[PDB]
A paper describes a structure:
ERGIC-53 transports certain subsets of newly synthesized secretory proteins and membrane proteins from the endoplasmic reticulum to the Golgi apparatus. MCFD2 is a small protein composed of an EF-hand domain with two Ca2+ binding sites, and functions as a binding partner of ERGIC-53 in a Ca2+-dependent manner. From the amino acid sequence, ERGIC-53 is predicted to be a single-pass transmembrane protein that consists of a luminal carbohydrate recognition domain (CRD), a long stalk domain, a transmembrane (TM) helix and a short cytoplasmic tail (CT). Here we present cryo-EM structures of full-length ERGIC-53 in complex with its functional partner MCFD2. These structures reveal that ERGIC-53 exists as a homotetramer, not a homohexamer as previously suggested, and comprises a four-leaf clover-like head and a long stalk composed of three sets of four-helix coiled-coil followed by a transmembrane domain.
The two different structures of the head region suggest its conformational variability. In component IIhead, two CRD dimers rotate along a vertical axis (i.e., nearly parallel to the central coiled-coil) in opposite directions (referred to as twisting motion) (right). In the superposition of substate structures C and D, S-H1 and MCFD2 in the upper layers and those in the lower layers rotate by 2.5˚ and 1.9˚, respectively, breaking the C2 symmetry of the head region. These rotations seem to be ascribed to the flexible loops between the CRD and S-H1 and between S-H1 and S-H2. Thus, the two loops within the head region likely generate the plasticity of the head region, allowing the CRD-MCFD2 complex to fluctuate continuously in the tetrameric structure.
Author numbering:
A (entry chain C), B (entry chain G), C (entry chain D), D (entry chain H): 40 to 102, 108 to 144
E (entry chain E), G (entry chain A): 42 to 367
F (entry chain F), H (entry chain B): 42 to 312, 324 to 365
The structure:
Amino acid sequence: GLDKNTVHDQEHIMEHLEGVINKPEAEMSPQELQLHYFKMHDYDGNNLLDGLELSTAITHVHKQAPLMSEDELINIIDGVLRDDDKNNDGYIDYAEFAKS
Amino acid sequence: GLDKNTVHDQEHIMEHLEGVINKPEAEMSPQELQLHYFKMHDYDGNNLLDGLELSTAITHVHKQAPLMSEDELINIIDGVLRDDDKNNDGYIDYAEFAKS
Amino acid sequence: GLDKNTVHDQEHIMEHLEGVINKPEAEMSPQELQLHYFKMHDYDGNNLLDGLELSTAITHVHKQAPLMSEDELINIIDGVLRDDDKNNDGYIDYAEFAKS
Amino acid sequence: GLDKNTVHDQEHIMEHLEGVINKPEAEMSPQELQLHYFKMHDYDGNNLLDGLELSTAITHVHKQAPLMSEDELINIIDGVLRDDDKNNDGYIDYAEFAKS
Amino acid sequence: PHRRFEYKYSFKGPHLVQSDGTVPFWAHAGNAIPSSDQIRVAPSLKSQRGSVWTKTKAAFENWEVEVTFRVTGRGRIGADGLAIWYAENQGLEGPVFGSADLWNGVGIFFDSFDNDGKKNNPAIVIIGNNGQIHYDHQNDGASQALASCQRDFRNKPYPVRAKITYYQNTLTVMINNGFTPDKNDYEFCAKVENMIIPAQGHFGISAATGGLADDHDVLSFLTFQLTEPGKEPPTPDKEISEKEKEKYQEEFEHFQQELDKKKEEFQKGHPDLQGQPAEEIFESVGDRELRQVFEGQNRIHLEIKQLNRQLDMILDEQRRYVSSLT
Amino acid sequence: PHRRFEYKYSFKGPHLVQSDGTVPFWAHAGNAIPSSDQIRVAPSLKSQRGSVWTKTKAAFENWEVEVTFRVTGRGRIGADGLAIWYAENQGLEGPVFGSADLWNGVGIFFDSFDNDGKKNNPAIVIIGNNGQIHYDHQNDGASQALASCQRDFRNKPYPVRAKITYYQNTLTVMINNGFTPDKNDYEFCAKVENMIIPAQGHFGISAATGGLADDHDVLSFLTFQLTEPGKEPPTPDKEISEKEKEKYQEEFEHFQQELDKKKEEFQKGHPESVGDRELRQVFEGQNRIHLEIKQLNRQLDMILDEQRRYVSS
Amino acid sequence: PHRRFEYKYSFKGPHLVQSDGTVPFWAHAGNAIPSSDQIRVAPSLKSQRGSVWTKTKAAFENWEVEVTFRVTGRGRIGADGLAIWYAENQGLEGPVFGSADLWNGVGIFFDSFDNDGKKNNPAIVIIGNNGQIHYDHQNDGASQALASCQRDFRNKPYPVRAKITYYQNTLTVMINNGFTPDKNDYEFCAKVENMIIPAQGHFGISAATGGLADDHDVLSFLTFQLTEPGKEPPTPDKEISEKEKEKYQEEFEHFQQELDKKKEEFQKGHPDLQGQPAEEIFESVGDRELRQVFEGQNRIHLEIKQLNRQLDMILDEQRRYVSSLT
Amino acid sequence: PHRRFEYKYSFKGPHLVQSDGTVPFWAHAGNAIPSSDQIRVAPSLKSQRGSVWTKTKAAFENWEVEVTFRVTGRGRIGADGLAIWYAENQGLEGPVFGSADLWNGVGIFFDSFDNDGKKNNPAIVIIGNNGQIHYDHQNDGASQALASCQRDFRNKPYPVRAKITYYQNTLTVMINNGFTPDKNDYEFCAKVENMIIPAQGHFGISAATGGLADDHDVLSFLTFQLTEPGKEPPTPDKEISEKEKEKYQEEFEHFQQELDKKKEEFQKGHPESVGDRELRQVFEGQNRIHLEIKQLNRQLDMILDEQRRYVSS
Ligand SMILES: [Ca+2]
Ligand SMILES: [Ca+2]
Ligand SMILES: [Ca+2]
Ligand SMILES: [Ca+2]
Ligand SMILES: [Ca+2]
Ligand SMILES: [Ca+2]
Ligand SMILES: [Ca+2]
Ligand SMILES: [Ca+2]
Ligand SMILES: [Ca+2]
Ligand SMILES: [Ca+2]
Ligand SMILES: [Ca+2]
Ligand SMILES: [Ca+2]
Ligand SMILES: [Ca+2]
Ligand SMILES: [Ca+2]
Ligand SMILES: [Ca+2]
Ligand SMILES: [Ca+2]
Ligand SMILES: [Zn+2]
Ligand SMILES: [Zn+2]
Ligand SMILES: [Zn+2]
Ligand SMILES: [Zn+2]
């Protein structure tokens, strides 16, 4: 549910950056890879995260695993929005995202 | 200025009905020829007379004569509307026209 | 399965002719309705019947009932083609259809 | 009336080239501006001048002045055609125009 | 409300003009060509400007205006368009739809060319002005647009009828789209609430033409003074009785129904009179282009026919040449 | 034949009208509305009549006029049509296509309304008149038609071009149908042999409008005097030498190329459409097919005359 | 106003669906075909009906909805059109734009077929209903039309974006016409004042197709809860400081500008990646017909070329036959 | 030859689908959406794949299939294109035009996207695989193309008709270009001589869509078994006499005429458009021009062979 170790995963970020950018690096800073995470999961391009993008981030398909129920997804995203988003805009910014 | 003898003119009505209806009659009732006058001068088809139809009715072109000035035309039509039209609709009906 | 009584059905022909033909007739000769059946069920307008058109003619909804199995339809159409069609063209003509 | 000084006028050529050509030049050879005059006043694009094009060239408004009389324009154009045009074609070519 | 038809601010066919050649109670200027049937405010030539205004000023607090017009263009793009003004001074010549700029009043613009390039034209734009605000010619008055509904009035099979009503400081524009011959088929376009306009002013219409060219005809112009039912002076003394009304209207109806039958036997009695439909008059631009392509193909058909006939001729010439030798 | 463009009996754009508001060397009357690029002889209003004639009379024995015009109607039926006159007196206003009746000269009528009801309109009708016979308006001049044609000139995508040539007492009318923008694409319409016309007279054009209404615009009117190669006397030694012409034309072409390159960087330095281009391509393709079939006809005629001479042997 | 994006009532690409094949927090029924970029609510086949509704009810007093959609037809006439509902009961199937009739809520209908024959279509019609009124299907809801602006949303080069805002009992519909790729280019269409709608209800969309057929795609659906500035409690004590914001946002911008240059040299380093314009995708119906005619002329061109080649062959065959005899 | 229509391997409208929702005697898979009048094998969404195959296997030595289809795209570039298979096993889902690779039979590909980049698309490619050839997807099967063609079948005004005939171990593909509504107007596209295919197998069709999007509708699919006149054994005395046929057909035609008159007064008793009719007239004129030029070519060939025999004498 968007834990500290969940975002801090070099392998997931390396898999996502594969293909789009051909720069396989060895080791990166936790803030650097969390910046990569935040930039990569923002599909729309508004430099913001929301519930629809976090739903893609959580319920993810790599290359088997059972699909998460809708109620658990709703509870997780509602908790994340209630905890991180302080401006009550609905969106999550990098300043709000850097707290956790 | 739309006098009793002006509407009561058999020759003018006979000239107007020439061509449109091929029924040259000898003598007609004054109410019959005034009905012909009212029906013929209603160019639009609303069974009503107004200032714009009375202007063409007064300033008329048969087969020379000098054209009437605008001020005299305005005064004549304003007097006719003030005298005959009682419902203040702007139009003149056959009920209002039959008074004079 | 294209029986003598199935083709000679006045109510079925009346239902098929409803809407398109606004002429409800009382009684008709058996050849007359059978001609109406043959003309109505030929959708392509080639004055010919085939297995697809016969399948549409037999298995249609009207106004609930379970659909007939495909094997029974295949057997019925194969029997009809083997019996009536003598020219081995695959199509059923009114010359061939008049036998039954 | 198509004089030597009238054709050799830098300000007139600059005014005609204004807008269409965004290149204000300082000084040009007399043949250069006369070529610009000939090319500009040929509206039809046939590389030829005629009485109508000469009349447009002479009597145009620019930026009041009274219009020239038609008889004077007729005399001027007739004199120009009689002088320059030797092939009797009706048109004025640059080969004929280079004389004056 | 209560409506009174004011003739001094109106013109209608088919006697729109007089022997002099001018519109009664109206002054026209520019390239306006008034005719008995209609007024062509701006013809289909390049750089045309025309305007027709009222002579005397109209002093109304609540009024209704019914404008019947046509805008016919050969192409699919118009140039400038019509403009209906209720102003303080006669604009006459000017650079805004053939009318003077900086007007003190209201104006409904039927813009048919998209100067702004926003692909939102043709459109109807209501603009009020106090006389010191320049009209945005290059942007179709987007900033000044109080209300802008979007409708097509060009190349319609029937004349477009618009109705502009000022009532309790509210201007309502209701536009017939000109698709049906019915008169009372108005459809709502726009409204503007709480707009201040001068109490007295001139009624006018104007049109202009840019690079492309349209014909901007106006068939009729009707003005009605509107009064509230409570503020209407009753004065019922002038009305005599209903008995005379009942004695008169039935003989009027009988005269009409007798005259119809009187005309019936001589409509067909004289075969010189002939009718004409109004369907072949209308044709779309794309339909016209397709008809032009179809007409152009006939030359190819005839030329191929000639080729085939000549080949038949040479074939028969070779046919008769064989048996002559033997 | 040799041709000389007479400017005094011609008009053309894009400066057709002057600041005064009149066509130079041309007098217009009626409802004609001259403009910068064309002359609308009769607009699309009801009962319009217009005419534009020459001021001075033209004295030619062999002449040619090239008239470019458009007749655009909203409906499918024309009003009256155009008329091109070579007369003795200026008709101005009148009841025959917006021009006076009883004219002494020739008139080419582009009739677009079938008064006779024979379903033979629109048509081109050449009528000569000495001034003593009235034109048959109700029958489209069927009796007076010296030579007729059958072309449609209404609502064409391109301006319709006509060429009328009086040469050796023969009047030839050749009409472009207005399907291609090419100027010299005339097709034969009609001809009259051994027709007598006045030696000198006025050139004019006129148009009228009846119950229906069309717009009769005239874009250009070009008059050429024609003379025979043998009849025209040459003037030796008056012309300049060819060396100076060769010296001049090379610098003229070099300067026009340099001017093209000079215009290139300022066309885009300082800042048609889709759909219209597709229709233009369609019309160009039709014209290409027509030209290819004409070439095939020429080749078939060539092989036919090749076999013609092989029979008598 | 203050806007809060509600994810439970929204769907966007490019992951609009899941591995299961359903839209999260949305239930679809009928002939709807959800894809990973859009939902084809009604495809281009005959007699199609589709609808996509929310699972949970939305309890808002002031809300904003942004709907991006496409209606693409081969012909010039639409099938039925889209419908956006805010009704309290999910209608999975029905006869009104593929949704059930007698709804308790508001519906914005993008009608694209003129049932009434008034030649006023395609048009956007806002209809409110309290659940006891049937829909005038044969007249495009002319009597029930609270506000009906006229706009064309078919065969546009860019997706049509519409915005429906309920605020202080006022429903404002602002429609981007889909002519420009810019997002914030909305143009006003209509407004309805003093309309009562249920406090809580389901957001839905639906489409239907008649004998003529269109493709009804929906690319996105966005829901924003709207609150007044005075009503919303600010509570600024939960924010830490602006110092952390200044410490974070500049490193975010620096990371973005560094990643741009990082991607720059490998965009062209690997030539496998190729671009594609979006201009050839759009083509008008008349332009397509003219292109079809131009393509059809190529057969005639080739056949005439073949005829000319054969005629040249027979000409040369006669050419070589002359000198053989002598 | 003698052609017997086999209903078990065919489908057509306007009752293509049943109340159950499946095509009779046909199994569909993938994103195929059968309807009442057509089967959309692949809609215009991203990454769509569909196929419709026969249930039972067809054992024919000479056969003919007449496929009517439409490939309609918003853009000018096709997605993948159609494919018509005569295989041994049902491919169903797969990566080759929405069908499985490694097929034992013949496949006709209507490729509409140029993967090879040779600017030679859309094109018709006949490929006969025998179970160990992987279709070259990135090169449009250039190496495996036994016979190619070059036709445009996208965005045509009329449905595109193709006829594929296996006769005497020769496969002939004749494709209508879709410019005319006439059915029997096929033009030659390709042929393959001496090709071996399995004696019995499944008839199928399939389509696929890439990043670009096209709609692949199939309106009909008709299969005819072919036999030679000499090989087919006649059955004398089984048929009925011609007298009964003459008796019957006259009353059939009389009744259909009477039914036309009966429908006449109720068509108008109880109550296309402009522009579309003009486009139809344009296409009809183009077809007439094409037919007249074809007749001209036939006449020229006739005179050419007439002169051919005149040389040796
Ligand atoms: Ca985002
Ligand atoms: Ca936030
Ligand atoms: Ca009246
Ligand atoms: Ca009254
Ligand atoms: Ca059949
Ligand atoms: Ca048979
Ligand atoms: Ca020139
Ligand atoms: Ca010369
Ligand atoms: Ca404008
Ligand atoms: Ca604009
Ligand atoms: Ca005539
Ligand atoms: Ca005639
Ligand atoms: Ca509708
Ligand atoms: Ca409607
Ligand atoms: Ca390919
Ligand atoms: Ca290829
Ligand atoms: Zn991942
Ligand atoms: Zn009189
Ligand atoms: Zn039945
Ligand atoms: Zn100058």
